[PDB]
Amino acid sequence: MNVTTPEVAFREYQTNCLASYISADPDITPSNLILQGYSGTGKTYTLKKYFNANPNLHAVWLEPVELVSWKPLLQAIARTVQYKLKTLYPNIPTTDYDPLQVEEPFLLVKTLHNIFVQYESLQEKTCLFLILDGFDSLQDLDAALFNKYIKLNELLPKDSKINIKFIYTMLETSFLQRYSTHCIPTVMFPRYNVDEVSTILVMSRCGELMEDSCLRKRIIEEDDQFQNVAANFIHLIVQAFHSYTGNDIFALNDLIDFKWPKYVSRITKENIFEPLALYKSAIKLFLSTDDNLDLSIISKYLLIASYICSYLEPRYDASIFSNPRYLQPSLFAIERLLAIFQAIFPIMKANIEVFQNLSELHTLKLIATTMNKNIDYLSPKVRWKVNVPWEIIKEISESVHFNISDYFS
Template identity: 45%
Template sequence: MAVNVPSVKFRDYQVDAISSFVSEDPLFAPPNIVIQGHRSSGKTLTMRKFFEFNPQIYNCWLNPIELVSWKPLLQHVARMISSTLVNLFPNVICEEQDALEAEDFYLLIKFLHAVLSSYQVLEKDISLFVVFDGFDQLQELDSELLPKFIKLHELLPQNLRVQLKFIYIIHDTAFLNRYSTYNLPTIVFPRYKHEQVAEILLQKKVCEYIESEKLLCKVVSCGLDPDDSTFEQIAENYIKIIIQAFHSYTGNDIVALGDLMDSKWESYIQSITADNINEPLSLYRSNIELYTTTGDTFVAEEEVHAQAGDNERATAYELSCISKFLLIAAYLCSYLEPRYDSKIFSKKSHLRAGRSSYGRRTKMDTNPRYLQPSLFPLERLFSIFQAIFPVEEQENYSIFHHTEPMRANVEVYENLAELNSLKLITTATPKNVDYLSYKLKWKVNVPWEIITELASSVNFDIGDYFSGLHY
């Protein structure tokens, strides 16, 4: 059966390439296809339109970003393939399989073999395309995951009536370059140009806005006759101005520009009057604030006025005492050499005396604070933290009280997690931080000006620890 080619603006080459690789006949479709392109480049839209125009080509979709790790991904693959075949061929008797058992690749192969074998009664061979929309967006992405899927078709019998084909929609070019030796068929979606973005948004949004009930009510309330040409002119002027105003902020991201248009549309309508409805320049001037700010904020609207009148409190670093000393300890770990720790922080007199084990603390050629922060293990952080924390002076804040040993440990890790979530202390591994792992390396992410202000709030003179080292 011939393949129907949909019309997608500025994606003619990509649509033709997809129609060449995607076929209902397994003999004419490769087992793996890669669709690569940056965000908002039309990958998903083009693929969905292609399958919409070709209902005879069976497919199922997965969003890896919603599945966190590879194990739920395998289970979801098993469940989607099974449910799709049941819906396509309800008359075929198939023994029910538990998709949750597919916890590893060999179990997924076993599951697929059992399910696909039930469809040997079909009259002809068919292709079932499994589309991973954003394969590289999986949070716990294993480097071996893609090669296993690439080789999956080799582990299934070749005489099955239902042949699985995989389509990987990938955003990151660097991720795809790791697997260049596999020579996978790849269709690249380039970024849209500025003129293309404007044309696409005009085609998509004008029809949506001229049918707006709020625009109709506003025009009628102004005592004007509703005219399609007037509505179209208002919508086109609005879309063009938004693109010009925020293109430097969003780039050629169609989704982001569309969201900005939708969020400001109602405010734009409210400013329409009988005097400016036919004067784009006057209408622009009455809405100048809409084009000078995105409206994004990190705090709730009711907190904006409270924070604006209390600047001093806003820079007071609302951290607990434990968090402050953990951050100070992390700064010391990143900018002081470990070999001096026993001399600087030890409370044992016999360790502080002599230089046989750690040598003289000489003046460095470069101020360590001007260098990049060094990585350090968690054990060293806790050792320095315990040495500088004022246990005797602040009994109430002491986390080393003997009556509550378990609460002490939990409280330290809770504060460490808080600092990590605030990006004040970061790790060498950006994802899925295991705070109990001894292999994990940490570093501070705070400049000298902030750490000195924070140290002064707890009466800690951090400058003494850098005396003789260009302080």
């Protein structure tokens, strides 16, 4: 095994496991290799640096998440393999095949067999790594999809100069346990802790924060000094959002960019050397997450009567007008809704104006029914139900000065 093992931060065991399987010799290279790991574990970072230091390995990258269905997945395999083998050996005259002719799992074996037959003029055996970054991220996923890819090397001819290599990068855990009896060398990726997450964000965001346009324009209006300033903001963001984000890299990277311009403008000629006064001046950037960044009168009263008919039994309605809110609402009828709506309305018959506001209440997805697509409002079997939470229905009744909390007390 002649290969170069790169140095990855907090990935000493993961980098050594990739060098023991991925090699330039197919005799010591497995046909299957699963890289299981959740988001924010560094699966793509440990794979790009491993293939960049070694230029003798030919790997083909493929994103199954950009193909939705499984039909374009079979077409993208034969299209990327022929394109990669064309630029690898331009001194070999091969025949171009149509990648759109792969519509069945059997057709993929015939297409790959028609390409490897014209590449037998080589000397040694050259591997062909087909990295499938995100196999379980495919839309139309089933339990029989992975069984058709783990047996692809069996149908391929053994006396071939180019052998395919499948590499899967799973995300969840239950999807991997469904094929544990196949004995596949899986390389797991555990999530980082509070000491490895902050160290990764420091060595990845310091090169873009100190050279930003906002920080360079603040020092002229009011390189070792700017490094400690950008490193202090990264450490203060993680320690203040460790419970809101957890251990995700994408959740913490968005909060840094959202608070970087607001933290640079709060730096003056005295807050550059005193980090104690800088944290007190911008206390509104660490105490909260800063979030993320006209109804009609008849329409307001219709949502109030719909909330009662969906969270109360209709057998006791002749004693009031004459916690159930924690569960799913119940379905009612059209005539049952107009009876309570007319009673709670202040000093009105059911004209076309009442039905007009009721039809618009369903367009905004404020009230659910029994059918989603192609609904029949004139059908007597289709019932209606509420579709708004308790917090939304509370602010609506408060604007019209209506006591909505006394009906459920």
